[PDB]
């Protein structure tokens, strides 16, 4: 979701490099945390289920 906001603020009409950078950072951090949590789930002996609610 954050990646799409970063893209939107980087279109030629909006062209807000600062807003785009803010969302790109939020996106990169959330992506990195996704992998970290998956690794923690397996570290504790469980298995990741991508359809878990």
């Amino acid at each position: 979701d954050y990646l799409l906001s970063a893209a939107y603020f980087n279109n030629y009409q909006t062209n807000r490099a600062g807003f785009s950078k803010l969302f790109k950072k939020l996106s990169d951090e959330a992506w990195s945390k996704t992998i970290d949590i998956i690794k923690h789930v397996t570290k504790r002996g469980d298995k990741m289920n991508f359809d878990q609610h």
């Binding site: 990646l3 030629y12 690794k39």
Partner: protein, 191 residues
């Protein structure tokens, strides 16, 4: 209350992508994201304590991040051409991947090879749509997809195919030790 600024308009003749090509690019973006999610599931599988192949896990988590970068590069290309001033929310949809388990490293490598093979075919179809539109041959995008994206695809396929061949030869009599050693080699560790 007026929370935003009344939009302005600047010249638009420079915005030239045509619909068929643009739609094929949008579909490719979703395909790259789908591939990133499928690789995340492979990384998760090999990270399990009962599977314990950290070399394969890292290989696939790295592949997941690379596919996410591919999606971002295609999005940046559209933005550079003047697109995505709207219809951004509908570009992507995150959904659980189709497969979540593999019998061993060989099955995962062969599945990855097949996924890459599908992506290569899809990129070639985007190239066809962008080049053969009777109203506009998008020379630059065709060149970009051919020289950057296909280059990465062919090298990647050869790499995965070689890994699969090498490991598969060890499966008839050395399934456990063969995969164990191969897995550590993926981490740069010579036992």
């Amino acid at each position: 209350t007026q929370c935003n600024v009344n939009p302005v308009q600047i010249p638009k003749d420079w915005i030239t992508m045509h619909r068929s090509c643009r739609n094929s690019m949008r579909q490719q973006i979703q395909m790259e994201v789908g591939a990133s999610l499928q690789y995340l599931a492979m990384g998760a599988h090999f990270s399990k304590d009962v599977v314990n192949r950290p070399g394969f896990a890292q290989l696939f988590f790295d592949a997941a991040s690379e596919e996410r970068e591919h999606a971002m590069k295609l999005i940046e290309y559209l933005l550079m051409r003047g697109e995505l001033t709207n219809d951004v929310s509908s570009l992507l949809q995150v959904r659980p991947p189709t497969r979540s388990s593999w019998k061993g490293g060989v099955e995962a490598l062969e599945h990855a090879l097949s996924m890459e093979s599908d992506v290569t075919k899809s990129i070639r179809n985007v190239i066809k749509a962008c080049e053969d539109d009777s109203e506009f041959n998008d020379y630059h995008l065709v060149d970009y997809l051919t020289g950057d994206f296909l280059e990465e695809q062919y090298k990647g396929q050869r790499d995965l195919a070689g890994k699969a061949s090498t490991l598969k030869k060890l499966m008839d009599r050395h399934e456990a030790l063969g995969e164990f050693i191969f897995d550590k080699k993926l981490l740069g560790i010579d036992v």
